[PDB]
Amino acid sequence: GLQRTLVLIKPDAFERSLVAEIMGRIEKKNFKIVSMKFWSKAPRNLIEQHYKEHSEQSYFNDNCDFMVSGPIISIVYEGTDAISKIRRLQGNILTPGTIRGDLANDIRENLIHASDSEDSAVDEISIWFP
Amino acid sequence: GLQRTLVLIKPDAFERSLVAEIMGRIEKKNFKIVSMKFWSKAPRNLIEQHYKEHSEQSYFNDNCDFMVSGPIISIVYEGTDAISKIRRLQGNILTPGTIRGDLANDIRENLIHASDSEDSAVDEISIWFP
Amino acid sequence: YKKAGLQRTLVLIKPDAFERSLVAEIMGRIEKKNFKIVSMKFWSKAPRNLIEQHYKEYFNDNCDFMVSGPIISIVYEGTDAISKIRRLQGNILTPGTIRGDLANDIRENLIHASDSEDSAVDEISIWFP
Amino acid sequence: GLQRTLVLIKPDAFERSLVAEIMGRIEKKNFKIVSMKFWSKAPRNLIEQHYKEHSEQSYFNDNCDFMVSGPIISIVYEGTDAISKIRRLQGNILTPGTIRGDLANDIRENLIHASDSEDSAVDEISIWFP
Amino acid sequence: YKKAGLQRTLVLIKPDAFERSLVAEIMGRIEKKNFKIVSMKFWSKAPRNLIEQHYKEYFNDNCDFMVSGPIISIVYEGTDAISKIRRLQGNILTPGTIRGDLANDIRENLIHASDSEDSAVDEISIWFP
Amino acid sequence: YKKAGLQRTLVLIKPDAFERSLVAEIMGRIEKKNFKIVSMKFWSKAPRNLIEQHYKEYFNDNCDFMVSGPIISIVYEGTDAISKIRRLQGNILTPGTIRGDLANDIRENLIHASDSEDSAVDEISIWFP
Numbered sequence: 001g002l003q004r005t006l007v008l009i010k011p012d013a014f015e016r017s018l019v020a021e022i023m024g025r026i027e028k029k030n031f032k033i034v035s036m037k038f039w040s041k042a043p044r045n046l047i048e049q050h051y052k053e054h055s056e057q058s059y060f061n062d063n064c065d066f067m068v069s070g071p072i073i074s075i076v077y078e079g080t081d082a083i084s085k086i087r088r089l090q091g092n093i094l095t096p097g098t099i100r101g102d103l104a105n106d107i108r109e110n111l112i113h114a115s116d117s118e119d120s121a122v123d124e125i126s127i128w129f130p
Numbered sequence: 131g132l133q134r135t136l137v138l139i140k141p142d143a144f145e146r147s148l149v150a151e152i153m154g155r156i157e158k159k160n161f162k163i164v165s166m167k168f169w170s171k172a173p174r175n176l177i178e179q180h181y182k183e184h185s186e187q188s189y190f191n192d193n194c195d196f197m198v199s200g201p202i203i204s205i206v207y208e209g210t211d212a213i214s215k216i217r218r219l220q221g222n223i224l225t226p227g228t229i230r231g232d233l234a235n236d237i238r239e240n241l242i243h244a245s246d247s248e249d250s251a252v253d254e255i256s257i258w259f260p
Numbered sequence: 261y262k263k264a265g266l267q268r269t270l271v272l273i274k275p276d277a278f279e280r281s282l283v284a285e286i287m288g289r290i291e292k293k294n295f296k297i298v299s300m301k302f303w304s305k306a307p308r309n310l311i312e313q314h315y316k317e318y319f320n321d322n323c324d325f326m327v328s329g330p331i332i333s334i335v336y337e338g339t340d341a342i343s344k345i346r347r348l349q350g351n352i353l354t355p356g357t358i359r360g361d362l363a364n365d366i367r368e369n370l371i372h373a374s375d376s377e378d379s380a381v382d383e384i385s386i387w388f389p
Numbered sequence: 390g391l392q393r394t395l396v397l398i399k400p401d402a403f404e405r406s407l408v409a410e411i412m413g414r415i416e417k418k419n420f421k422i423v424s425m426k427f428w429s430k431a432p433r434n435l436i437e438q439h440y441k442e443h444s445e446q447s448y449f450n451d452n453c454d455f456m457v458s459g460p461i462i463s464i465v466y467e468g469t470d471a472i473s474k475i476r477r478l479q480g481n482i483l484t485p486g487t488i489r490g491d492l493a494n495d496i497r498e499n500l501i502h503a504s505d506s507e508d509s510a511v512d513e514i515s516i517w518f519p
Numbered sequence: 520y521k522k523a524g525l526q527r528t529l530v531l532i533k534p535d536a537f538e539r540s541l542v543a544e545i546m547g548r549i550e551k552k553n554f555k556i557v558s559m560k561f562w563s564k565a566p567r568n569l570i571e572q573h574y575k576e577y578f579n580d581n582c583d584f585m586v587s588g589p590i591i592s593i594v595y596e597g598t599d600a601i602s603k604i605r606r607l608q609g610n611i612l613t614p615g616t617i618r619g620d621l622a623n624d625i626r627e628n629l630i631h632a633s634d635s636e637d638s639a640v641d642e643i644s645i646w647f648p
Numbered sequence: 649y650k651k652a653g654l655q656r657t658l659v660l661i662k663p664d665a666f667e668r669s670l671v672a673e674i675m676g677r678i679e680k681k682n683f684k685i686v687s688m689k690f691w692s693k694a695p696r697n698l699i700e701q702h703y704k705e706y707f708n709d710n711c712d713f714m715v716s717g718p719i720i721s722i723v724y725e726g727t728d729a730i731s732k733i734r735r736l737q738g739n740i741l742t743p744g745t746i747r748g749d750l751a752n753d754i755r756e757n758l759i760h761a762s763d764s765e766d767s768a769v770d771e772i773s774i775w776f777p
């Protein structure tokens with residue numbers, strides 16, 4: 001059962017030279033790249049539609065400022081249970097073995113975003129890959 | 131308390147060039163290779179005695195076809211709590227940090243098999259290493 | 261984004277890299293050498309057109325390989341980027357290099373990097389007008 | 390919220406050539422080295438003040454003998470939630486993805502020690518870095 | 520199993536590799552170069568006999584090392600496998616190679632690879648009759 | 649601790665290595681070549697003094713870099729350690745080496761290793777009297 005999920009490689013991954021290292025972990029898990037776009041500086045409006053459900057929260061503007069402070073890469077990966085499986089690779093900073101667990105230490109500069117559900121994926125994918 | 135467990139490196143590991151990568155993780159955990167046999171194409175009868183407890187299940191024939199579609203390696207590792215420890219390294223595809231968690235994405239082509247118990251180990255070891 | 265430099269070069273990550281899951285491995289070596297990405301473009305199957313202009317010099321046989329699977333064109337920036345990355349690409353006989361460590365075929369060699377300032381300019385023009 | 394924790398790289402890491410591999414995992418998690426001391430052979434009295442809460446336990450002398458059988462490195466790392474985060478990287482031998490999980494197989498020769506609490510950290514840091 | 524080629528060579532993964540836990544590291548470099556395994560044999564302690572025939576040319580001192588710990592003999596297949604793998608083995612002074620990156624001793628050098636077509640044939644015969 | 653040898657050399661892990669989080673990566677390559685650590689010293693900011701004596705030969709510009717961020721001085725021991733580690737350090741153009749794979753600047757080059765027996769002795773004296 002193939003699925004497609006959207007993944008974002010945040011500006012901090014570029015600053016810390018962890019782009020290849022992050023994509024590699026996903027690649028080694030056997031997921032394929034269907035679509036890919038490189039953003040030297042993603043358009044703010046595009047960032048705000050993506051994080052719109054956090055529109056009423058405190059760090060919304062900062063997270064937005066951050067997502068626009070460096071290049072970004074948006075990828076559409078394809079694979080079996082891709083959405084759930086990749087969301088797990090991403091993990092969290094308190095779980096070693098995952099991407100955020102082994103490489104991140106901030107809840108804002110967390111190197112990567114992966115769709116968390118089917119709806120979220122279809123919406124997220126339509127945003128960066130209309 | 132030393133133990134010996136049986137490990138199988140499945141055909142997909144060869145197709146995907148992950149043989150060294152899998153053995154390395156076990157090696158780095160400090161387990162030693164006691165016995166090793168390389169099978170360009172393991173004999174089907176040997177495969178069926180090994181998966182005989184699944185003899186009445188749907189994917190039995192397919193899993194069997196798969197295990198005979200490429201080379202295989204059978205290894206007997208030795209170490210403290212080897213059986214339980216290695217079974218954990220193997221893990222599952224939903225748990226990053228483990229072998230199946232970081233490299234597999236199918237419940238059939240799961241790159242590796244590790245004995246799941248003492249009895250299973252003694253029986254499995256007598257099968258590939260009579 | 262420190263990486264930045266005094267030279268711009270074109271890199272092509274070939275289909276075989278995708279089939280053998282070495283895309284990251286390859287990009288990692290360049291990234292660790294501290295070169296930055298200026299432009300990047302992914303093609304599920306680069307246009308027959310561009311492949312022809314690029315190698316415009318068994319021509320059709322290789323062209324077929326470069327069009328089979330997907331490719332990624334990248335523009336790297338850094339000091340002496342052209343030469344340095346070329347050395348990273350290396351060849352099938354030189355261990356320590358990308359082709360040296362990961363490839364064993366003169367056509368299916370995983371990656372392409374501009375060999376000269378002239379090449380780089382034309383190559384960047386073909387993939388990034 | 391920065392914190393400082395104390396970390397010890399045990400003699401076995403040296404024997405097994407895993408010093409860089411262990412420090413690398415901590416480094417990649419983005420923690421910085423504040424202080425560092427290399428001990429060809431740490432002084433026994435220093436080892437006993439550190440493991441003094443185990444003074445009445447069976448393996449106390451052995452663990453002590455071991456900690457003095459090879460070189461050791463004491464490091465003070467600094468980062469956000471450093472104490473808790475690094476304690477997690479260290480993990481245990483039953484949890485792959487962590488340092489002990491991927492590289493250790495003995496509860497004594499466990500390659501690394503990381504402070505387990507703030508008090509433990511302040512005390513441990515005053516011990517090796519008075 | 521694409522790897523396949525036009526040449527067959529013999530590799531010996533020495534005891535020190537096992538003691539230093541570099542067996543996988545070593546096999547990985549060859550596997551990433553895309554060479555396939557044809558034959559493989561593990562010896563908890565290769566026969567004194569075979570060690571003698573192999574190096575049949577301080578002879579006894581080295582023979583002792585090759586018989587101390589375990590060894591793994593492997594037959595690799597690929598285009599120009601003999602030469603290519605030999606270059607991967609390299610030497611103690613050449614970084615980027617197996618011996619170059621991982622060894623620092625002329626006897627205890629982790630791995631052996633056939634140096635020529637003739638050698639390869641005889642070596643494969645000794646370990647894989 | 650087998651590593652041990654017949655030669656002693658001095659290594660400096662520069663500030664850029666810390667900023668780019670390559671300290672372990674660098675130390676790992678030497679450790680895998682099986683060299684052992686004899687002496688080691690971490691400096692949050694090595695003394696202006698020592699930097700001057702070391703390079704005592706734009707002098708002030710480089711001295712500033714070596715004093716900006718932290719550094720780690722290490723004394724490695726092994727057979728032919730001086731030469732061998734020097735080769736591991738290599739240069740910006742040689743892939744497979746530390747500078748070859750990870751650096752792209754003649755000043756900010758991540759690591760320093762004694763180039764000769766004489767150098768090694770003086771360098772070890774400056775950082776480890």
